[model samples]
Target chain A: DTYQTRSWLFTPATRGADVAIIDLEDSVSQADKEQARQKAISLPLALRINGLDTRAGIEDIHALLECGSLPDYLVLPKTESAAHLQILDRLMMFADTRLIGIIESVRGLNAVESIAAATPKLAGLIFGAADMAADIGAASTWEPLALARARLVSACAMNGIPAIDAPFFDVHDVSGLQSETLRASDFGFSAKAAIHPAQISTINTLFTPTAAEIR
Target chain B: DTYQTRSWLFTPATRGADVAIIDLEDSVSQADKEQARQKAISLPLALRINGLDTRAGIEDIHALLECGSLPDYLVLPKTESAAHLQILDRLMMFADTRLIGIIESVRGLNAVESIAAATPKLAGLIFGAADMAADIGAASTWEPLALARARLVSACAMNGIPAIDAPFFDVHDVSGLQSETLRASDFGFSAKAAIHPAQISTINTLFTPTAAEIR
Candidate 1:
């Protein structure tokens, strides 16, 4: 289950990449959150919830619980502790729900290892560079966040799970995406996120093996 | 007790610091370790033990357990978990043994908060820049290590303990030392380390209140 995907995309709708994420977190505004969840219920894939600390996240859980139709994966944003996963585990026990945790803050990174091994229902860990950079007082560039990337890989590997990379925002720069994905693969990420569908082939191509050492 | 000092120094011999740490870890060579312990036993202050994972650290703990005289504080290098403190608690209960944990690795920084509040016997947390830089894959400069410093401050403050900064190693750069200590104080470090007796005045002066509309 952990090795199922190479590219996870935050799409408009449907399984756009290897795994499409229907985001209910950062991409959607506060006023539009309910509408987004309604759409997510209508349009299912790996659905990203709002931060558990937020009111929208509270509603997301309750709404999803009552709705009966759940996404294949429930992605938790700003996952700061093992307790976050445990709470989800208790609430989503009846459903075949898998979790992907996004480490978006210094606090989340601090307890990354604990969160990784917290439950067997975990899909893996995802590195959210934008918020993580803000939280740690660093730039959102790859070098500044390379430490966080490596740390995520370490924790995920320890827990025998995959580590997922954040999307390359510069969707048109094909070479930059290629180089970044190569570096991430070198650093031990099992998957990379794509903001645009155009970035998926690069992710899939770089992540997949192409006739290297048949023996 | 946390506010008693602004400068903690690893001394050659005797109490030359506001709080002198008799280092039996990195400062002394492996050949000289047993001899250093002999000297430390005779010339007592706060003692820096080798890492808990090391052979020498094991020896230091066992030897201290048997010895009649004990240092006021025991410093654990690369302090990575609350369990490290729990282990010390079980081992060093009788003797007035307090702990100073040095967060020198990514693992230590990751579990910093848990370690800070792990026990009542904790004196404080110290940031070890050299190993931390190597572990986090950053330069051992102020800019690169700034996040680690801030995280330490946050963790220590959460547990009501003092945050300790690594010594400015450029012993002769007086202005750099002054500026660095001032910056650390601004970022909420209650104390700073001193590599030499000469650096103590700069540390103490910057950390102490000169005059700020005394209310």
Candidate 2:
């Protein structure tokens, strides 16, 4: 089972939380990616967050997760392979690390089944839009991704795993974020990633189980 | 000085574009991802002839470039910093590599000022829609992206660089992709990335310089 709610867990590499989430994706800069990776290394959180978002590399990921005490979890971005996770699994076995994969592209969406079966440390899966948009070369629309998300969600459900929706980077689009949260929740996604401090509350409130759920 | 075209590009992996690109992300199974990754590593052509795609991981990308000795150009993905490029740059220094940087989120968009300054190796900046969509938690119909795209385009223009509009994933949605291609092109975009082979011809046809440009 997943957590109590789809909390907008934000663990600023500078701060600490249950999930020490740090992005190595589009929002970060190359100069800063190293900083993010290094800072993430020093954090005491149980999980380590890094995006496997390369059109091509894994060295930064190897560096951050491999050294200075490994993080419990590794979040892969633009996830195209369970081999990517298997690589993570092999790396993590030395330290016993868990893995979280995000379906960030149409290609990834299509491969979710294989991705889910890649390893036991596969804690969960996430759905990312920005990368998906880039992958398909389309306007960011739910219609285009509807089937992809549904397919992944269904796979996660079958595996008895949790699925996390993508992060909402537009802090100002509260309504949009809420709608996505509700949509993902309905689709059976247990969590969603957040990009800003302001978005945490909104996600938490929307994702938390309702009184009806208790029944 | 951007090229205006209605063309879409898709890379083909060895296994199968649909299997690796679409299956991996949807829950295909670990065995499949591994099998596909190995297969994709040996793909003969990088571009999809029509509505097909495949990708390379760092090692694959590295090997491909080295085997043939670098193309005149290439596209870089999810770049939030020039640091990743720096690493790639060092690798390609032995073999000249000019590249188009695809920006996927607000942070990349925000850091445009600095990112734009990083290299003359940058041919243009393309906005990645899926990642941006996930980042904002907005659907593909997301209007706010216009502002974001505009910001990046302006930065590229200011820096004497061309701005590329991200791709439209729906290969079959000719009308949808067409409208978006025109919108971005009309809005002063230099060119667009492709997700399907079917899209390239259309994009190339639409974005080609008008009589005024040729004159």
Best by TM-score: 1
Best by lDDT: 1
Candidate 1 structure quality by residue, lDDT tens digits, B64-126: 877767877789998999999989987888656788899997778878889999999898999
lDDT of 2 by residue, A43-139 (tens): 3233434444462136565675468576555677667777878887876676456677878764566578999888878878878766765554434
Checking candidate 1 for backbone clashes, the offending pairs are: none
DockQ of 2: 0.03
Instruction: State the number of backbone clashes in model 1.
Output: 0
Q: What is the DockQ of candidate 1?
A: 0.04
Q: After superposition, how far is residue A76 of candidate 2 from its true place, in Å?
A: 1.3
Q: Give the true-contact fraction for every prediction, in order.
A: 0.00, 0.00
Judged by DockQ cut-offs, the docking class of candidate 1 is incorrect
Off by over 4 Å in 2: A1-5, A8-18, A43-58, A61-68, B1-215
Which candidate leads the pack in DockQ?
Answer: 1
Off by over 4 Å in 1: A1-215, B12-16, B213-215
Interface RMSD values for the candidates, listed in order? 6.7, 11.6
